[PDB]
With several copies, the nearest count.
Chain A
Amino acid sequence: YLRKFVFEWDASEDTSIDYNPLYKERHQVQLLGRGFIAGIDLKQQKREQSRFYGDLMEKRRTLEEKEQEEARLRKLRKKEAKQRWDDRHWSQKKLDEMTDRDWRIFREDYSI
């Protein structure tokens, strides 16, 4: 009411320096607890999500629905644990379980 070849941008060119709390801390999207932002790790997004919809399901789901979801989560976690157990670190890989890719990972990941 009142030269220089710069490869990286300058920090003064930044925007989004707001004073309104409604605009600084913007409430992220919770796509019904089932949609995730692209690129980011799915497990990280699951861990850091607001967990509001998990409470909503645990409050609204019937006993049979709870059993169904528990069984599905059991199977999915079993598959994930199999993948993790299979994905043993090259050194962690058992002597006999060290394949050619595991030996290459042990040779490359080590400092020697």
Chain B
Amino acid sequence: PNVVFIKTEDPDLPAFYFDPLINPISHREPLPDDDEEFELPEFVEPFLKDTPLYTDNTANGIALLWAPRPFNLRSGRTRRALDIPLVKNWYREHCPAGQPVKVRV
């Protein structure tokens, strides 16, 4: 399935924000009658009403969800400097369109 993660460019914007990349949704029910006697007790409120919807480091975490493998984790095991190929993903991907013959080979 196509990951449709929208990357945030402006840190000032809210973490949960309708980015212009997302296609705007064109708006337009057996509802109970309002006159009925349904009452909510005073002990009842939203589960995390006090909890803010987003924090300064929420978009950063959501970005870290879709980071490459060495950054998707938060705990891990140390590796040898030999064992880390810094450029393995570079040639694992497609060669750039405009390149000479020798670099393609």
Contacts and interface: CB of A to CB of B under 8 A. Distances in A.
Interface stretch (A11-19, A90-98, A101-109): A11-19
Contacts of A11: 101-102, 105
Contact of A57 (B20, B101, B102): B20
Interface residues of A, number: 29
A26 B94 contact: yes
Contacts of B104: 14-16
Contact residue range for chain B? 20 to 34
Nearest to B9: A34
Given A11-B101, A32-B6, A38 B20 contact: no
A9 interface: yes
Contacts of A10: 105
Contacts of A25: 97
A39 interface: yes
Contacts of B20: 56-57, 60-61, 65
6 tightest Cβ-Cβ pairs between the two chains A and B: A34-B7, A60-B20, A9-B105, A14-B105, A61-B20, A57-B20
Interface of B: 6-7, 9-10, 12-13, 20-21, 24, 87, 89-90, 93-97, 101-102, 104-105
